Design a protein around this ligand. Structure first.
Ligand SMILES: O=c1ccn([C@@H]2O[C@H](COP(=O)(O)OP(=O)(O)O)[C@@H](O)[C@H]2O)c(=O)[nH]1
Ligand SMILES: O=c1ccn([C@@H]2O[C@H](COP(=O)(O)OP(=O)(O)O)[C@@H](O)[C@H]2O)c(=O)[nH]1
Ligand SMILES: CC(=O)N[C@@H]1[C@@H](O)[C@@H](O)[C@@H](CO)O[C@@H]1O
Ligand SMILES: [Mn+2]
Ligand SMILES: [Mn+2]
Ligand SMILES: [Mn+2]
Ligand SMILES: [Mn+2]
Lengths: 530, 530
């Protein structure tokens, strides 16, 4: 309700925030948490973080500068940089974390480059937010710059629907999407604006540091810039063996270099608004949460965009511990498979061949849009954007199906635990997903189809896949599973899994494995009719 | 001996249990003694009259409990998939077990019966033991080769016993039956046809009765749809719950397959592959109890459908005044805790109803089960209540607005179930102490006032608990002034004179003002520590 900045200075570029006319803070900080606080409870009561502590900490909390020293040697001309609209969507975000995020942005963003701060209430039900509530939020916003504007979805629409509401309400040539439980490092916005100014086709995302949900300590982010994806359709940081496949000039980049990434971690990024809509914005038939980051990543790269990571733009993020819709996660994965072309056959089988209502009629309009825009193929994506992946073409998956030993008339069985850490069994073949395995030849990995993170080991037991010799298997021309490092072979003798000297005359070590020969085109599965 | 001599209607597998010399392989007992004390014989027979069971024939003819229209259906046994029938037993007497086997063989066409797997779950009876008198093994030699016996060296329980049989089955479909049953004609054909069309269906026959005392065949009086109680036990749809169904489903034809939120016991058929893909059983369940609800919840949430076939009927001996075996006391509680994993926030209500137990529910294994639920992409329990069981009295926890003491401030006392909590006894007024005996809950959808430990017991204006019914005889309103008003008579409950009597409603009389703690459970149920 007031656009003035009284008290502006370093660490508080928008002036003293949230001060009442009488010079008192517009909210009552909480006392120190009780000494007998039961943490697993508070987390379950606080929606994934310790709210007793969050309420006690100041909204103007000072954070360590997580940037590399060389990031501070950079110069920005705030007069020539374009303005940006910061968007924070939230559903029932507690007052302390939400307002600390707002305070962090205003305190650490020069007013010259910040057009506005848009808060999107995605149908919250907490009394402190509701239109028919106690009005705490609305009352407190009057104590912040007029830049801050609140808009609401009368019904919770989800991440996509909520972000679209905010993006549409923005003015700046650039918008920046942030979480509702964050704290920024210094000069977080300047690098993003300069990068997008030079080329509006770039979608740039800050690097994400951590705030401990239990202690709220500031933690350095350990994630590199480059993110791949798993065939379960979730982003996955480049592993050691994947980083080694990069061009030698990109394996150890400077801490100030902007680095491309095939995929986006979450939803913290900046983009030119015009280009964002021309490249398809979001798929608004996505439901609530899940996979929209990968769908955007695939579409962006294929349809003329660039996804980059800015190590000099850092934002802290509270990762939940204590925790806190129907069919939404599976639907979003099916819709994302549109952009995977023939590779969708592999992803479809990995997530269990679901038969859901993915809104086919709407997905077909999205297919028409993809055609008109002239987007490139997923094969192009794998070969040019993510060529470091273990599966660049489907020929990299030569086998997919049961691993059957004819001698004992049984098949390998993950025993209902596709998670790493458990023993693999021998059971009578029934053709279900629990008994199908696939082979990634680039790494010699034997994995259950429902989890490309679990790998068979000579111990006869599953463990987390690593691109090393500890998980490298060869499937001989005679049907043997040979562990390359020890040059031994896996046997089913006595309905037990043991490693034995290789000998193709021993029928107990001869396995059959269905060849994987998927079609040139993935035909989506038919859909049927509170 | 896969040959069958004497095959005809009533004995589709031939004359069973005939010795080489043409005599039956077992001697029927004489008529029960005339001076038989029935309450004793039931206790000494494991829940049924064994004197009579031993006297009855193994080929006992049963009445056709099917609706007349069920016989007008035709099945093509050549196009139906085969099934493996599994019967697990722990110390089941010879007469009831073999009558079950005879009933299945006599009444199942050999073209659709792959095999009959008998699972000895560590029985100790001499007639079963490997080191016993060999009665069972010797008598099995007089039955078709389809019938094969397998054993658990140590008693594993219902889940462990069934999984052994399921894993050992060969047919694409398995059907589990109890060891004390008799089937109606064409019991298996409807299940095979239904699962053939859609392998995601788990179909269960309707269960008729065999009187434990007289062995009379009795028509089951329970409809097809089964809900559940917050004590975590299946419960047949009630009258007022059926009325909430769509009008086209309140009285369906006797040939229609009907969905059911919950499974009665363990009598069902399923595609073996799909059964394993949907998590099979939770093999950390102990001994007896609740696996049917865990399977029911998991089945619906993870892409399955539970249906009941009224044209598929099986008689079942329900025990009376006795049990065929004992189990630890905490084993049932453990199974209930593990079932609460699939109930999400609703587990808070279930936890309180069964008395906030603190048991060793094997958390490390249950947390792996949680990861499986995430990878599989199973839907939430709220989805289940709103989509699978929307006819329940508690669809959201908002349907339970009050849970806690019912206290009258005037006399400084609370309602007290007086150590009963079972229906049929008077409710008392006692000094408040905060224990389970003094906490009550309110189901607003039917106006029920119940002790927290029994959602089947309802307060009545008589000052006494009785079996809950969805009628005006149990409807209470909790006014804005704190009154318990019986809607039918428009009177209010008073504590005047430390007695519970109905009086004219008047918010100025302090003897009729009650306080009732509001129920506001968390968004997430945190399991108790072990
Ligand atoms: O239905 C929803 C779910 C989430 N969000 C908001 O979207 C942002 C991203 O969600 P989340 O915080 O879960 O992301 P993550 O914690 O995985 O970084 C947060 O501000 C949420 O409050 C929302 O507006 N609607
Ligand atoms: O530890 C056990 C308990 C039960 N059962 C068998 O499992 C079936 C189901 O048990 P029961 O009939 O007692 O269940 P109820 O119908 O009484 O709920 C019966 O054939 C039991 O003999 C078993 O094999 N092991
Ligand atoms: C199948 C079925 O309705 N079973 C019920 C069960 O729900 C419960 O009422 C029990 C007595 O408490 O008796 C019986
Ligand atoms: Mn977040
Ligand atoms: Mn990895
Ligand atoms: Mn039984
Ligand atoms: Mn009832």
């Amino acid at each position: 309700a007031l656009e003035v900045l009284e008290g502006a200075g370093p660490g508080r570029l928008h002036g003293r925030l949230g001060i009442k006319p009488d010079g008192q803070p517009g909210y009552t900080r909480a006392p120190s948490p009780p000494t007998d606080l039961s943490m697993p409870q508070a987390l379950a009561r606080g929606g994934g973080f310790n709210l007793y502590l969050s309420d006690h900490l100041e909204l103007d909390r000072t954070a360590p500068d997580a940037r590399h020293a060389s990031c501070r040697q950079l110069h920005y001309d705030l007069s020539t940089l374009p303005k940006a609209s910061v968007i924070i969507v939230f559903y029932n975000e507690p007052f302390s974390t939400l307002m600390r995020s707002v305070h962090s942005v205003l305190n650490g963003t020069p007013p010259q480059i910040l057009e506005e701060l848009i808060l999107v209430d995605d149908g919250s039900t907490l009394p402190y937010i509701r239109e028919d509530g106690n009005q705490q939020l609305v009352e407190y916003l009057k104590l912040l710059p007029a830049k801050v504007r609140l808009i609401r979805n009368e019904v919770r629409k989800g991440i996509v629907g909520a972000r679209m509401k905010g993006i549409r309400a923005s003015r700046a040539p650039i918008f920046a999407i942030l979480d509702s439980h964050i704290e920024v490092s210094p000069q977080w916005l300047e690098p993003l604006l300069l990068r997008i100014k030079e080329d509006s086709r770039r979608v740039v995302m800050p690097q994400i540091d951590g705030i401990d949900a239990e202690t709220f300590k500031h933690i350095a982010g350990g994630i590199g810039c480059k993110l791949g994806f798993l065939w379960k359709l979730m982003e996955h940081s480049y592993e050691g063996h994947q980083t080694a496949r990069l061009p030698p000039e990109e394996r150890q980049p400077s801490p100030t270099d902007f680095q491309t990434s095939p995929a986006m971690a979450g939803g913290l990024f900046a983009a030119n608004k015009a280009f964002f809509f021309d490249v398809g914005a979001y798929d608004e038939d996505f439901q609530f949460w899940g996979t929209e980051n990968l769908e955007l990543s695939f579409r962006l790269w294929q349809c003329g965009g660039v996804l980059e990571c800015a190590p000099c733009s850092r934002v802290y993020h509270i990762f939940r511990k204590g925790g806190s819709p129907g069919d939404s996660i599976t639907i979003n994965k099916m819709r994302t498979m549109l952009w995977m072309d023939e590779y969708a056959d592999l992803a479809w089988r990995v997530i269990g061949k679901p038969r859901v209502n993915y809104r086919p009629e709407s997905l077909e309009k999205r297919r028409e849009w993809r055609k008109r825009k002239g987007c490139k193929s997923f094969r192009w994506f794998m070969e040019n954007v993510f060529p470091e992946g273990d599966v660049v073409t489907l020929d990299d998956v030569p086998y997919l199906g049961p691993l059957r030993n004819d001698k004992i008339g049984m098949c390998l069985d993950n025993m209902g635990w596709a998670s790493p850490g458990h023993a693999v069994g021998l059971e009578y073949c029934h053709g279900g997903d629990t008994q199908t395995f696939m082979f990634f030849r680039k790494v010699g990995h034997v994995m259950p189809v429902n989890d490309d993170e679990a790998c068979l080991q000579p111990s006869g037991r599953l463990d987390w896949c690593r691109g090393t010799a500890q998980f490298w298997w060869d499937f001989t021309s005679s049907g043997q599973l040979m562990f390359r490092e020890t040059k031994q072979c896996l046997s089913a003798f006595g309905r037990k899994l043991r490693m034995v000297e290789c000998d193709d005359t021993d029928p107990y070590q001869i396995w059959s494995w269905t060849a994987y020969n998927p079609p040139d085109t993935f035909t989506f599965p038919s859909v049927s009719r509170g």
